[PDB]
């Protein structure tokens, strides 16, 4: 910005001034910004319906999360997807679980994500995502891990 000298009141500019800069913090854009959360009554249909043709799958390990319930919360917050059927509450310390995510991505296209959770002592998940575009799938998959 351009600075013109001022006597503090609320504002008043000097006849001449100098260029000055002020440094700011970084802005972080999250997948959460791109997606608006929703749940589905039946994930499986929606999940197929959006586009299994943009389907990509990647496996992640969440080692800093020792249970399913926290795991579902991390993918849900990051992506900006509300887990379907109230799947943030998962049977505590169950060996397998299927996590249903839904939300709509920018442009107005739905993004669904399925994370099949395995619980050892840490959480591993194979996250399969489907979307009406290549971009949401890639985006979610990358952000989670």
């Amino acid at each position: 910005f351009t600075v013109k000298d001022c006597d503090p009141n609320t504002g008043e500019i000097d006849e001449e001034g100098y260029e000055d800069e002020y440094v700011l913090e970084d802005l972080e854009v999250t997948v959460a910004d791109h997606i608006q959360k929703v749940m589905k009554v039946n994930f499986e249909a929606a999940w197929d319906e959006v586009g299994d043709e943009f389907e990509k799958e990647e496996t992640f390990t969440l080692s800093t999360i020792k249970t399913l319930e926290e795991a579902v919360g991390n993918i849900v917050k990051f992506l900006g997807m509300h887990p379907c059927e109230r799947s943030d509450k998962v049977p505590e310390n169950k060996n397998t679980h299927t996590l249903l995510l839904a939300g709509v991505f920018r442009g107005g296209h739905d993004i669904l994500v399925r994370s099949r959770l395995l619980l050892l002592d840490t959480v591993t998940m194979q996250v399969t995502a489907r979307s009406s575009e290549e971009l949401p799938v890639d985006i979610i998959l990358a952000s989670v891990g």
């Binding site: 100098y18 260029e19 000055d20 800069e21 002020y22 440094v23």
Partner: protein, 129 residues
């Protein structure tokens, strides 16, 4: 270990710009000490305020004196240190007369007499290279 003692100092990137007890403002690149500029009096580095386009120094006074950092010299020499002699040459059109000869001598010390020959304004330095 650097030749000129650091009375006070500041980090601009990974390059250390410091004052010396010689009143020399030097910068440490590569483990080599180069003099960015000469201080006439004893000065301390308040900090580098990007706004003013300056490094703010203060004497004995709780007032401001300013030295803009000679970035073109510093970048030429830094690039030389990295062993990016060509890169330092891109900087050369904006290194003046005697400074091209000096920066050339930097290039040379690090190595590559020839690239130093193209940048050195002075014919004698070319002739020796």
């Amino acid at each position: 270990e650097i030749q000129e003692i650091v009375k006070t100092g500041l980090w601009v990137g990974d390059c250390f710009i410091y004052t010396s007890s010689v009143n020399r403002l030097n910068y440490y690149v590569g483990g080599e000490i180069v003099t960015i500029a000469h201080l006439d009096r004893t000065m301390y580095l308040l900090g580098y305020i990007p706004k003013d386009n300056r490094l703010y120094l203060g004497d004995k006074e709780l007032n401001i004196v300013s030295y803009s950092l000679l970035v073109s010299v510093l970048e030429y020499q830094t690039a030389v240190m990295r062993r990016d002699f060509s890169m330092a040459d891109k900087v050369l059109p904006t290194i003046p007369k005697e400074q091209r000869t000096r920066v050339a001598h930097f290039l040379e010390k690090q190595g590559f007499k020839q690239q130093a020959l193209t940048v050195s304004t002075d014919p004698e330095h070319r002739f020796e290279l």
